[PDB]
């Protein structure tokens, strides 16, 4: 006859009914991802709308219970996830306008074409079309045209829509006892109610700006070396003191630097590590890929896979009689059902992908005992970290020689570790400032700190100072460059790509030190050792019942976030880079511009 | 002598629900448990108080066949000394049970595509049941002191919830058809033994 008993009864009724609708909402989506057809295209919306209506009514009914009378942490955690109204607090016309804007922003981005109106051959799709001309081309004007013309059409019709979006979401967020939309987006990392592990929204910026200062050193030398190496391909467009042009980073915007490896190889005469020639010649197919990837997880002590993981899963492209969207997503149907759906091909990039997507099902298999509202990971940047450390331990020449992929006597020398370390560094270090500056820009523009006239000046003002990237042509206030990104047009968060990289090296160092390795960190492995698997599994069983600070301390021993393991991991390459960068000009200048004549 | 009808209790085409579990009085028949161990289909065969070897040399006065359907991760609750949503609201085994619990997977016989919602169970009850007690009612549970005169509204809910049996659900949710053979010795003649 108390609030904490009525809440338990309400939660029991909610929990013992939603399991029968979420499973049917997932099954229709699985069938659609298998079949692109106009017949089943509306089952997605029907099942989603029924579930949202159930959730909307439950959220409306849950508002009658205050949070100041409940003492149980588990009950408070379950009830806090149900009282979040979302956009239901707005008026009807405003909600309809917000929905229209949201459904139009995606349509414009999806159906936006780029072509040259003067030459008929200068037309192509996006993937593998316009994304291919920006990947493997060594021309200047060919890239400049495709870089300028994409943001002159798609990035120019979204500016009024984004201006209305900002003012609509500010009013949406100010009605939920919040300050802005940025404060709404930082509510995931807020932990309260536990003494000694309290985290505030105002400390995330302080932590991130402190972690970036320790990192900047190494990125500065890496940028100097890359800029010195790029002088050979474009000798008349880059300054040896200034910054790097934006449209020469490897892709459309510059998030990843992976495609630049073919031009800046340190040792070009050594045979690179490769398994692509090792799985085609060995008659290795997608079935045996997973049959072999299972044993790596069994060796450390993890349970075995379920029976339905083989019969209901799709591994190969299902011909031309049906279309399947095979973007990388792991499928958890719930109610004891686990499947996969990937576009398998005989390449190295797909073997590590299979290991990564099997780590996901291994993680989801752990917390099945938690309730429906707590069957989730600790936070957003926490699920993607435990599935990435398994790929790092399988590409080393201690395991690739164990499964017969690599040569039995593939020599490990100082000329192969450098090649591996450069490839590892080009994909990890090059994106951290890119994520950081974009998130800082969003948080600064949502708070009203930047008025209308500097809506596009303070973009390049921070691009030219933090990441050291200049623009080829000037842009006035009419353009909207940031909205051209997929995650910005579809209003997705971005700091989960910054936290996971920091967490994944702490986890790896803790596990490998528990695994009793002696030597450099880039050669070790966790296989054939149960004391690392049983150390990780206790953390894997927690779910959302415990704060992320406690989950981090249960494994690493430090409730904060550190960069020291990452610096120790990349120290071997940094030592050689310091030696090789004696004659270069370490650092960049903010006064240089390619159009400043 | 005749063959005791074990095919209608274990091989029935349609079973009952746990809240309204059926009860078949099987007595004055020749029960053969020797073919049960060799059936190679029982996913769970646990006997409390009695042994599988001693089941063919002892005769019980009454062999009551209580039959119902439960989940896979839930069969362990049907045992002396367990708690849950079923061991106190639907059917409680006494702590001094002297019978056996049988179960096997029947996903291919108790599941259809799109859903089979023909089995239900109790969810809300104001008290806890005594062992060996059945109560069938759809009365609305008053979770507070509003009160509620029958309308399923604020803090007043329907007690009966259904079972979502489908071909693709997990092993822990697959229908395990359970017949709880409740052997007991009374002051009446016993002639039920192999």
DSSP string, A184-245: HHGGGS-B-SSTT--B-GGGHHHHHHHHHHHHHHHHHHHHHHHHHHGGGT-TTT--SSS-EE
- Tokens encoding A30: 């699985």
| Distance, first Cα to last Cα, chain B | 12
Closest CB to A336: pick one of B154, B157, B173: B173
- Per DSSP bridges, beta strands B62-70 and B44-47 are unpaired
Which SS3 state, helix, strand or coil, does residue B161 take?
Answer: strand
- Burial class, A139, CB count within 10 angstroms (exposed 0-12 / middle 13-18 / buried 19+): exposed
Distance of alpha carbon A107 from alpha carbon A146, whole angstroms: 21
For residues A555 and A507, is the Cβ–Cβ distance under 8 A? Answer: yes
For residues A426 and A260, is the Cβ–Cβ distance under 8 A? Answer: yes
Q: Which residues pair with B192 in a beta bridge?
A: B60
Distance of alpha carbon A439 from alpha carbon A181, whole angstroms: 13
- Per DSSP bridges, beta strands A469-470 and A244-245 are parallel
Alpha-carbon distance values, A357 to A376, A390, A537, B183 (Å)? 17, 10, 18, 51
Cα–Cα nearest to A259, from A143, A352, A342: A143
Q: Is A509 noted as a catalytic residue in this protein?
A: no
Closest CB to B170: pick one of A16, A20, A335: A335
For residues A181 and A170, is the Cβ–Cβ distance under 8 A? Answer: yes
For residues A207 and A213, is the Cβ–Cβ distance under 8 A? Answer: no
Q: Does residue B148 sit at the A interface (CB-CB below 8 Å)? A: no
Tokens 């695994």 locate to A515
Tokens 């053979």 locate to B181
DSSP tally for chain A: helices H, then strands E: 22, 4
Distance of alpha carbon A587 from alpha carbon A223, whole angstroms: 8
| Residues near A162 by beta carbon (within 8 Å), at least 6 away in sequence | A105, A480, A483
Cα–Cα nearest to B43, from B74, B83, B9: B74
Question: What's the residue count for chain A?
Answer: 597
| Phi, psi values for residue A325, rounded to 5° | -80, 115
Please answer yes or no on whether A13 and B144 come within 8 Å at the CB atom: no
For residues A60 and A88, is the Cβ–Cβ distance under 8 A? Answer: yes
Cα–Cα nearest to A245, from A147, A126, A122: A147
**Between chain A and chain B, how many beta carbons pairs sit less than 8 Å apart?**
50
Question: Is the peptide bond between B147 and the residue preceding it cis, with omega within 30 degrees of 0?
Answer: yes
Tokens 């016989």 locate to B109
Distance of alpha carbon A387 from alpha carbon A389, whole angstroms: 6
Distance of alpha carbon A199 from alpha carbon A189, whole angstroms: 7
- How many other C-beta atoms lie within 10 A of the C-beta of residue A572? 17
Report the Cα A581 to chain-centroid distance in Å: 32
> Annotated catalytic residue: which of A357, A388, A439, A509?
A357
In chain A, which residues have their Cβ closer than 8 Å to the Cβ of B144? 1, 6
Cα–Cα nearest to A395, from A363, A371, A419: A419
- Tokens encoding A82: 């149900």
Distance of alpha carbon A53 from alpha carbon A59, whole angstroms: 10
Distance of alpha carbon A591 from alpha carbon A76, whole angstroms: 54
Distance of alpha carbon A319 from alpha carbon A328, whole angstroms: 19
Alpha-carbon distance values, A226 to A200, A229, A255, A468, A582 (Å)? 39, 5, 15, 12, 14
Q: Does residue B164 sit at the A interface (CB-CB below 8 Å)? A: yes
A→B contacts (Cβ < 8 Å), by residue, are 1, 5-6, 9-10, 12-13, 16-17, 19-20, 23-24, 27, 61, 64, 306-308, 312, 333, 335-337
Tokens 């588990």 locate to A74
Report the Cα B118 to chain-centroid distance in Å: 16
| Residues near A197 by beta carbon (within 8 Å), at least 6 away in sequence | A191, A547, A549, A550, A559
DSSP tally for chain B: helices H, then strands E: 2, 9
Q: Helix, strand, coil proportions of chain B in percent (round to 5)? A: 5, 25, 70
Which SS3 state, helix, strand or coil, does residue A409 take?
Answer: coil
Report the Cα A429 to chain-centroid distance in Å: 14
For residues A233 and A263, is the Cβ–Cβ distance under 8 A? Answer: yes
Dihedral angle sign, alpha carbons of residues A292, A296, A301, A302: negative
For residues A249 and A260, is the Cβ–Cβ distance under 8 A? Answer: yes
Report the Cα A480 to chain-centroid distance in Å: 23
Distance from CA of A18 to the nearest CA of B (A): 11
Q: Does residue B45 sit at the A interface (CB-CB below 8 Å)? A: no
Which SS3 state, helix, strand or coil, does residue B184 take?
Answer: strand
Cα–Cα nearest to A44, from A59, A57, A33: A33
| Residues near A553 by beta carbon (within 8 Å), at least 6 away in sequence | A559
| Residues near A257 by beta carbon (within 8 Å), at least 6 away in sequence | A226, A249, A250, A426, A427, A430, A431
- For A338, nearest residue in chain B (alpha carbons): B170
| Residues near A336 by beta carbon (within 8 Å), at least 6 away in sequence | A306, A368, B169, B170, B171, B172, B173
Distance of alpha carbon A424 from alpha carbon A421, whole angstroms: 5
Please answer yes or no on whether B162 and A27 come within 8 Å at the CB atom: no
For residues B137 and B76, is the Cβ–Cβ distance under 8 A? Answer: no
Dihedral angle sign, alpha carbons of residues A450, A454, A457, A461: negative
Distance of alpha carbon B51 from alpha carbon B193, whole angstroms: 14
- Burial class, A518, CB count within 10 angstroms (exposed 0-12 / middle 13-18 / buried 19+): exposed
Cα–Cα nearest to B119, from B83, B69, B170, B183: B69
DSSP string, A425-484: HHHHGGGHHHHHHHHHHHHHHHTT-S-STTTTHHHHHHIIIII-EE-SS---TT--SGGG
For residues A529 and A517, is the Cβ–Cβ distance under 8 A? Answer: no
- What resolution in Å is listed for this PDB structure? 3.3
In chain A, which residues have their Cβ closer than 8 Å to the Cβ of B164? 19-20, 23, 335
Cα–Cα nearest to A510, from A451, A568, A470: A568
For residues A1 and B144, is the Cβ–Cβ distance under 8 A? Answer: yes
- Per DSSP bridges, beta strands B160-162 and B120-122 are antiparallel
Please answer yes or no on whether B168 and A19 come within 8 Å at the CB atom: no
Distance of alpha carbon A246 from alpha carbon A364, whole angstroms: 40
Show the CA angle centred on residue B57, arms to residues B54 and B58, nearest 5°: 85
Distance of alpha carbon A279 from alpha carbon B190, whole angstroms: 69
In chain B, which residues have their Cβ closer than 8 Å to the Cβ of A336? 169-173
Three-state SS sequence of A496-514: HHHHHHHHHHHHHHHHHHH
- Per DSSP bridges, beta strands A337-339 and B100-103 are unpaired
Closest CB to B168: pick one of A16, A20, A337: A337
Distance of alpha carbon B115 from alpha carbon A21, whole angstroms: 11
Q: Is A357 noted as a catalytic residue in this protein?
A: yes
Element (H, E) at A54: helix A43-61
According to the entry, how was the structure determined?
Answer: cryo-EM
């Amino acid at each position: 006859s108390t609030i904490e008993e009525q809440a338990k009864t309400f939660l029991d009724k909610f929990n013992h009914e939603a399991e029968d609708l979420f499973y049917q909402s997932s099954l229709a989506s699985w069938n659609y991802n298998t079949n692109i057809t106009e017949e089943n295209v509306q089952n997605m919306n029907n099942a989603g709308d029924k579930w949202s209506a159930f959730l909307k009514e439950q959220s409306t009914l849950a508002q009658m219970y205050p949070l100041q009378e409940i003492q149980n942490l588990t009950v408070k955690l379950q009830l806090q996830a149900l009282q979040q109204n979302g956009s239901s607090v707005l008026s009807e016309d405003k909600s309809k306008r917000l929905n229209t804007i949201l459904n139009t922003m995606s349509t414009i981005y999806s159906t936006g074409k780029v072509c040259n109106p003067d030459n008929p051959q200068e037309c192509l799709l996006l993937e593998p079309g316009l994304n291919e001309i920006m990947a493997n081309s060594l021309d200047y004007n060919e890239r400049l045209w495709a870089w300028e013309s994409w943001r002159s059409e798609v990035g120019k019709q979204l500016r009024p829509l984004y201006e209305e979006y900002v003012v609509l979401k500010n009013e949406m967020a100010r009605a939920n006892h919040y300050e802005d939309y940025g404060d709404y987006w930082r509510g995931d990392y807020e932990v309260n109610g536990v003494d000694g592990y309290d985290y505030s929204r105002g400390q995330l910026i302080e932590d991130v700006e402190h972690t970036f200062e320790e990192i900047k050193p190494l990125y500065e030398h890496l940028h100097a070396y890359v800029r010195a190496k790029l002088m050979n391909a474009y000798p008349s467009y880059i300054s040896p003191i200034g910054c790097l042009p934006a449209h020469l980073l490897g892709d459309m915007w510059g998030r990843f630097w992976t495609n630049l490896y073919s031009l800046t190889v340190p040792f070009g005469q050594k045979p690179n590590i490769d398994v692509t020639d090792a799985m085609v010649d060995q008659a290795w197919d997608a079935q045996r890929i997973f049959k072999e990837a299972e044993k790596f997880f069994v060796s450390v002590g993890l349970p075995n896979m379920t029976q339905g993981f083989w019969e209901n899963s799709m591994l190969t492209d299902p011909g031309n009689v049906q279309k399947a969207v095979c973007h990388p997503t792991a499928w958890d149907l719930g109610k004891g059902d686990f499947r996969i759906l990937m576009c398998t091909k005989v390449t190295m990039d797909d073997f590590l992908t299979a290991h990564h997507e099997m780590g996901h099902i291994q993680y989801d298999m752990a917390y099945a005992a938690q309730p429906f509202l707590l069957r989730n990971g600790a936070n957003e940047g926490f699920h993607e970290a435990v599935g990435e450390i398994m790929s790092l331990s399988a590409a080393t020449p201690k395991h690739l020689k164990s499964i017969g992929l690599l040569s039995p006597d593939f020599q490990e020398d100082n000329e192969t570790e450098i090649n591996f370390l450069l490839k590892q560094a080009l994909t990890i270090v090059g994106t951290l400032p890119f994520t950081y500056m974009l998130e800082k820009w969003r948080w600064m523009v949502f708070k009203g700190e930047i008025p209308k006239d500097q809506w596009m000046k303070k973009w390049w003002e921070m691009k030219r100072e933090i990441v050291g990237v200049v623009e080829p042509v000037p842009h006035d206030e009419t353009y909207c460059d940031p909205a051209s990104l997929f995650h910005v047009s579809n209003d997705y968060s971005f700091i989960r790509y910054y936290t996971r990289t920091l967490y994944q090296f702490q986890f790896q160092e803790a596990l490998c030190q528990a695994a009793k390795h002696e030597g450099p960190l880039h050669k070790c492995d966790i296989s054939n050792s149960t004391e690392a698997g049983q150390k990780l599994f206790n953390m894997l069983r927690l779910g959302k019942s415990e704060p992320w600070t406690l989950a981090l301390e249960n494994v690493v021993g430090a409730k904060n976030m550190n960069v020291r393991p990452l610096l120790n991991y990349f120290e071997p390459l940094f030592t050689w880079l310091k030696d090789q960068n004696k004659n270069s000009f370490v650092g960049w200048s903010t006064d240089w511009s390619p159009y400043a004549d | 002598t005749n063959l005791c009808p074990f095919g209608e209790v274990f091989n029935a085409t349609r079973f009952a629900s746990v809240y309204a579990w059926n009860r078949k009085r099987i007595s004055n028949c020749v029960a053969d448990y020797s073919v049960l161990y060799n059936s190679a289909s029982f996913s769970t065969f646990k006997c409390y108080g009695v042994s599988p070897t001693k089941l063919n040399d002892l005769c019980f006065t009454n062999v009551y066949a209580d039959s119902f359907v439960i989940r896979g991760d839930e069969v362990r609750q049907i045992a002396p000394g367990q708690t849950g949503k079923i061991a106190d609201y639907n059917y409680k085994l006494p702590d001094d049970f002297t019978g056996c619990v049988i179960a096997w997977n029947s996903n291919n016989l108790d599941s259809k595509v799109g859903g089979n919602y023909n089995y239900r169970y109790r969810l809300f009850r104001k008290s806890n049941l005594k062992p060996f007690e059945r109560d069938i009612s759809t009365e609305i549970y008053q979770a507070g002191s509003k009160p509620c005169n029958g309308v399923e509204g604020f803090n007043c809910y329907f007690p009966l919830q259904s079972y979502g049996f489908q071909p693709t659900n997990g092993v822990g949710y697959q229908p395990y058809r359970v017949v709880v053979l409740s052997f007991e010795l009374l002051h009446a003649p016993a002639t039920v033994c192999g």
